[PDB]
Paper text:
The heterotrimeric Replication protein A (RPA) is the ubiquitous eukaryotic single-stranded DNA (ssDNA) binding protein and participates in nearly all aspects of DNA metabolism, especially DNA damage response. The N-terminal OB domain of the [name] subunit ([name]) is a major protein-protein interaction element for RPA and binds to more than 20 partner proteins. The [name] domain adopts an OB fold with a five-stranded anti-parallel beta-barrel but has very weak ssDNA affinity. Its primary role is to mediate protein–protein interaction with its basic and hydrophobic groove and a side pocket, as first shown by a series of studies of [name] interacting with p53.
Several studies have demonstrated that [name] physically associates with [name] through a motif in the C-terminal region, and that this interaction is required for the correct localization of MRN to replication centers and for the S-phase checkpoint. We fused the RPA interacting sequence of [name] to [name] and crystallized the fusion protein in the P212121 space group with one molecule in the asymmetric unit. [name] residues (538–563) form a long helix with a short N-terminal loop situated in the basic groove. Positively charged RPA residues R91, R43, R41, R81 and K88 interact with negatively charged D544, D549, E552, D559 and D543 from [name]. Among these residues, D543 and D544 were previously shown to be important for RPA association. In addition to these charge–charge interactions, hydrophobic [name] F540, L545, I548, A551 and A555 residues pack against the hydrophobic residues at the bottom of the [name] basic groove. In addition, [name] N556 and S547 form several hydrogen bonds with [name] Q61 and N85. ITC titration showed that [name] binds to [name] with a KD of round 16.3 μM, whereas the triple mutation of the hydrophobic residues F540, L545 and I548 resulted in a KD value that was much higher than 100 μM. Mutation of the conserved arginine residues in [name] (R41, R43, R91) significantly reduced the binding of [name] to [name] peptide. [name]–FLAG with F540/L545/I548 triple mutation led to slightly worse colocalization, in agreement with its reduced binding to RPA in coimmunoprecipitation experiments.
Numbering used by the authors:
A (entry chain A): 0 to 119
B (entry chain B): 533 to 563
Write the structure that this text describes.
């Protein structure tokens, strides 16, 4: 199964246990910029682990070239090597992707894998 | 489950900036 390529349950592990030591393989579902006048763009990502999606992933600014040169794009599969979880003033949590590797390009995967459901 | 995700205002973005910079600064103790 194509879902065999993804780290099913990694999103729940991050959200429920705060496990920051896993190196999960995830699929990018969508990418949206968040822009400000003096700041570089901040890329927000809807990611899938094959079981859940989560829309509160954020790309570290130093990885912006991956989005701007289209290597990190919707449908691609990536392995997260380092991430942190940050809690906002209102209680929401974001997962900041600090280091990753694109394992398979969007064009080599071709479609959303499986039928994941939103975690929140 | 109802939208593309709640949005992040300037204050939220400043907090995210700080979180990533704190990780970068800690790297300076090992690199």
């Amino acid at each position: 199964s194509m879902v065999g390529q993804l780290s099913e349950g990694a999103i729940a592990a991050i959200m429920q246990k705060g496990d920051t030591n896993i190196k999960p393989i995830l699929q990018v579902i969508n990418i949206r910029p968040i822009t400000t006048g003096n700041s570089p763009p901040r890329y927000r990502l809807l990611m899938s682990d094959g079981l859940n999606t989560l829309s509160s992933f954020m790309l570290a600014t130093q990885l912006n070239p991956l989005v701007e040169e289209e290597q990190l794009s919707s449908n691609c599969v990536c392995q997260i090597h380092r991430f942190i979880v940050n809690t906002l003033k209102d209680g929401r949590r974001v997962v900041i992707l600090m280091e990753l590797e694109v394992l398979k390009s969007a064009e080599a995967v071709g479609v959303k894998i499986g039928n994941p459901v939103p975690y929140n | 489950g109802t939208s593309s995700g709640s949005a992040f205002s300037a204050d939220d973005l400043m907090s995210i900036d700080l979180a990533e910079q704190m990780a970068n600064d800690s790297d300076d103790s090992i690199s």
